[PDB]
Design an enzyme around this catalytic site. Structure first.
Site, short mmCIF file in Angstrom:
data_model
loop_
_atom_site.label_atom_id
_atom_site.label_comp_id
_atom_site.label_asym_id
_atom_site.label_seq_id
_atom_site.Cartn_x
_atom_site.Cartn_y
_atom_site.Cartn_z
N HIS A 17 -9.17 -6.54 6.14
CA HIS A 17 -9.69 -5.42 5.38
C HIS A 17 -8.76 -5.09 4.22
O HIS A 17 -7.55 -4.91 4.41
CB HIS A 17 -9.86 -4.21 6.30
CG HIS A 17 -10.19 -2.94 5.58
ND1 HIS A 17 -11.49 -2.53 5.36
CD2 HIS A 17 -9.40 -1.98 5.05
CE1 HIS A 17 -11.48 -1.38 4.72
NE2 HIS A 17 -10.22 -1.02 4.52
N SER A 62 -12.71 1.20 1.28
CA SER A 62 -12.40 1.93 2.51
C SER A 62 -12.70 3.42 2.37
O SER A 62 -13.86 3.81 2.20
CB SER A 62 -10.94 1.73 2.90
OG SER A 62 -10.78 1.82 4.31
N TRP A 105 0.80 -1.21 0.00
CA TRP A 105 0.00 0.00 0.00
C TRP A 105 0.84 1.27 0.00
O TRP A 105 0.29 2.36 -0.22
CB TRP A 105 -0.94 0.01 1.21
CG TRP A 105 -1.66 -1.29 1.42
CD1 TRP A 105 -1.38 -2.24 2.36
CD2 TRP A 105 -2.78 -1.78 0.68
NE1 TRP A 105 -2.26 -3.30 2.24
CE2 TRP A 105 -3.13 -3.04 1.22
CE3 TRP A 105 -3.53 -1.28 -0.40
CZ2 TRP A 105 -4.18 -3.80 0.72
CZ3 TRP A 105 -4.58 -2.04 -0.88
CH2 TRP A 105 -4.90 -3.29 -0.32
N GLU A 159 -13.13 -7.40 9.20
CA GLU A 159 -12.84 -6.01 8.87
C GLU A 159 -11.85 -5.38 9.85
O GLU A 159 -11.05 -4.53 9.45
CB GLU A 159 -14.14 -5.19 8.85
CG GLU A 159 -15.01 -5.45 7.63
CD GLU A 159 -14.47 -4.79 6.38
OE1 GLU A 159 -13.54 -3.96 6.49
OE2 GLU A 159 -14.97 -5.11 5.28
#
Ligand SMILES: O=C(/C=N/O)NCCN1CCCCCC1
Ligand SMILES: O=C(/C=N/O)NCCN1CCCCCC1
EC number: 3.1.1.7
Lengths: 540, 540
Positions: free
Chosen positions: A444, A200, A83, A331
């Protein structure tokens, strides 16, 4: 051939690149400028359209990532590095990307628009997990994804002022949607069939465009994956946004000692600071220790959001709208290693009773002690109140339900009961190549790689079942983008995906097995968060 | 033979009667006076021992029932009139009964002492369902049961005064226990092995004798069936008990307007009123409309109960004590036809959502509106929030858990974790001859007929399996009375009944099927009543 890599838009000419897939090539136009670089005096200001250019802009590679915090919790760990920015950081980052099938569609083709997540403080459209070559090749749709300013550069807000009005990161996305309406036809895309989908914070962004009139006319469908605009983390008040912006200015020496601190002189001092200096103090403005909380998020200002997202969802009429919502099975497990006591990705995180009680205050930040006792009451198995494994799964449910599952279920119920056609899902497949520990389950953010057909990449070690499972999900998303219905209109053999209603509350499970219909997105748990807990705080 | 029907006690001589059972005869001594008639100036006063008498007192039939309210909700209905008095009403009612096997035991035999229920406002030892001829014959134990003053005559309290100190009904039971210690040997009973067992208010009475030092030395084991002393209905404060006693006096013209109203003049005026007059105004004393609430109950005065039952249970050492507690499957369904809107024994009682919300205020009388919201949250199936059948079972759970199940579970957990060995059960068999509607399931109080072996009565239409089931239950109660353990002292074939502990919380289900071990007496529901709700009432 190579002629399909040349495209003229309203701003000028572009040169794309051909991307290879196991099933055929795809034409990609990466790094298209849709706005003037928001640098210098344009910092914290709404975006201006990109003025036309001379020559041929090279659109063969991704552009720069917007300045953002880089995660350093687990250096070298794939689960977090995937990410982080994969391009250099720059305030010159307002660029979008367009994937189109080869050969280019001669008929107008429905368009998918991706909005990445990242808690409004991070993210980029250049990440490998957002590679749209497999979704475009398999389903022959047009995929668009843009960069938007995150962190202080996108959501620092001094409400009422004009040098930093806030929500400029949302206006970056809106400008990208206006660019799609004016130029997606040149790539073979249909501007009358635009389907937004995000995850998200991106899902919260998609929801906020549903509640903003100037943005609602730029798209026709919405897909919200593990996010909602009505969550406790997606918005902040005007008073709190002013306190955080003033605290960030103080941390960077603004204003200089002995200078008045009005909104004009405060933003002017902020615009002189290097971009990295503001990033290095972003996390030091949160009011208390917490997880799933972010410094600079969209602000309820009365402009982009005329009211709170909850108020707009209740009073909204959504007739003629198709929505696809859903969550992952676990989550909250990802966010526990970011502050909850006794948690670690490198052990089993078998927390004690005291660590669970402390973790609730971190997972549910700044609530009364009576409110925390109610959370413990609902999420404690009183037949095994000290079992570490059950407590670990309990705190995961606390963070997941409070931040994602119940805000999504709240939104899905109000949408279906007020005109919109809603489809709900729960992603329950843990990838065979997942690097996160086993106790996190399906964390998540790890349904995205299957929506984008990443298992089809030959350089990866996905199983044969996951490749077939990825093609099913791409079929679901594309069918919803084409017709507003994830069910294949030619196949009654496949198990049907029933719509989500406020009464039946039907949803399907997404895994290697065929579709299975279930009822209730954690109805008992979400009745506590959506119905009782607000009353417990009103009486304090 | 007929010689065993003649018995001499400390007060004098008695002649009993022989009762017939399908398995053999039983010697019974019904109507033994253990106290002076609490009439005239003795009204509202503690009992005095029965003075010795000349000649032979006839003990061949039950004596008078204490003055009490007579249920008139369903005239002619067996389900209600089986609890109504079957003898004439009189203040001269302090008599006890003794069942002993034939031939009379030559060795000391464990003694069972029954304390009937009836919300401390009704009940009698002469009821057909309390017939102890089958339990005494099948298990060769000695059974004793006494009458105690109920209603205002037993529990009207002007705290501090000497004319009406309160709890005199509990003192009637204590005097009957002192009578057993001094005279049960003449019937073949062991005064060193006395086991108290009662139901509803009788079970609460058994618990209050555990918490009273002068009574604790009179028995050695306790059985509490569907009742506990810590329930919200079993006790009342000093201030509220004074208000109810003054309101009853006002309703009967006391004091005569306009004279003084000190406690001496108030009780003196009450002692001049006929007993039926006081009964006719008993229910017009409760504060609010409710179910499972009673006017004159034991008072926390500092005498019989030095503190609240909750405080005495927490700070009590119960080492060397064996307790047998349990409940029925549907504790609250019986009380819903006594005030809950939309309920009727002659229809399906398919209540609406509004009737359920109103019924919560009747089932949980005088709590904050926020507290009612917490009750509605916990007992609403939010997937079917309007289903009439589920709402009917939900309100039944609300009343049963709040008044019986959770007070019993809280008591059993504290007893086990503080020295006492506890056995827990859940009665899940609905009698084939039950006259109450089917939706009530296994109502409160309908395990008694099986404990007393009533199915063995040849003039009744019980099934063959219920006769075997009743015999197995009588063995459980007798084995606990003899050895402190309901399990067979030597038989290993039948499944075992494990003790109840605060951690494992094991209990067994009592029905036609063999013993089945389960865990948790509604642990999730009772954590709301015992842990969270008191904190919600503190912070109003
Ligand atoms: O990531 C940081 C950096 N602190 O300097 N702090 C914890 C915030 N976490 C991490 C951000 C998203 C996951 C939940 C919230
Ligand atoms: O039975 C009456 C008589 N009212 O005058 N009212 C209903 C209240 N009931 C009375 C006892 C049986 C159910 C518990 C509460």
């Amino acid at each position: 051939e190579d002629a399909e890599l040349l495209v003229t838009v309203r701003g000028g000419r572009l040169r794309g690149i051909r991307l290879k897939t196991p099933g055929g090539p795809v034409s990609a136009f990466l790094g298209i400028p849709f706005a003037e670089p928001p640098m210098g005096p344009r910092r914290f200001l709404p975006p201006e359209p990109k003025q036309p250019w001379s020559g041929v802009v090279d659109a063969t590679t991704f552009q720069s990532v917007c300045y953002q915090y880089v995660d350093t919790l687990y250096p070298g760990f794939e689960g977090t590095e995937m990410w982080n920015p994969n391009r250099e950081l720059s305030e010159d980052c307002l660029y979008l990307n367009v994937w189109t099938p080869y050969p280019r569609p001669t008929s107008p083709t429905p368009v998918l628009v991706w909005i990445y997540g990242g808690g409004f403080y991070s993210g980029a459209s250049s990440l490998d997990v957002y590679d749209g070559r497999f979704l475009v090749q398999a389903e022959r749709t047009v995929l668009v994804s843009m960069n938007y300013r995150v962190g202080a550069f996108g959501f620092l807000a001094l409400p009422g002022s004009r040098e930093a009005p806030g929500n400029v990161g949302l206006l970056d996305q809106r400008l990208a949607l206006q660019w799609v309406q004016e130029n997606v036809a040149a790539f073979g895309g249909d501007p009358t069939s635009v389907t937004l989908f995000g995850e998200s914070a991106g899902a919260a962004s998609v929801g906020m465009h549903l509640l903003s009139p100037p943005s609602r006319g730029l798209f026709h469908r919405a897909v919200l994956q593990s996010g909602a605009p009505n969550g406790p983390w997606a918005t902040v008040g005007m008073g709190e946004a002013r306190r955080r912006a003033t605290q960030l200015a103080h941390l960077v020496g603004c204003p200089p000692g002995g200078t008045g601190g009005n909104d004009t002189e405060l933003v002017a001092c902020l615009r002189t600071r290097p971009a990295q200096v503001l990033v290095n103090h972003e996390w030091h403005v949160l009011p208390q220790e917490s997880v799933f909380r972010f410094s600079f998020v969209p602000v309820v200002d009365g402009d982009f959001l005329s009211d709170t997202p909850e108020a707009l969802i209740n009073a909204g009429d959504f007739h003629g709208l198709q929505v696809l919502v859903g969550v992952v099975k676990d989550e909250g497990s990802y966010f526990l290693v970011y502050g909850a006591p006794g948690f670690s990705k490198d052990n089993e995180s078998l927390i004690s009773r005291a660590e669970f009680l402390a973790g609730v205050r971190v997972g549910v930040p700044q609530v009364s002690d009576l409110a925390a006792e109610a959370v413990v009451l609902h999420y404690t198995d009183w037949l095994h109140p000290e079992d570490p494994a059950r407590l670990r799964e309990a705190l995961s449910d606390v963070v997941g339900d409070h931040n994602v599952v119940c805000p999504v279920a709240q939104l899905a119920g109000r949408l279906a009961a007020q005109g919109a056609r809603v489809y709900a899902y729960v992603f329950e497949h843990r990838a065979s190549t997942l690097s996160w520990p086993l106790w996190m389950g399906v964390p998540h953010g790890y349904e995205i790689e299957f929506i984008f057909g990443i298992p089809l990449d030959p350089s990866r070690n996905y199983t044969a079942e996951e490749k077939i499972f990825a093609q099913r999900l791409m079929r679901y998303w594309a069918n919803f983008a084409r017709t507003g219905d994830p069910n294949e209109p030619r196949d009654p053999k496949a198990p049907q995906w029933p719509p989500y209603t406020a009464g039946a509350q039907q949803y399907v499970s997404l895994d290697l097995r065929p579709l299975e219909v279930r009822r209730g997105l954690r109805a008992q748990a979400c009745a506590f968060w959506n119905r009782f807990l607000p009353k417990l705080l009103s009486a304090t």
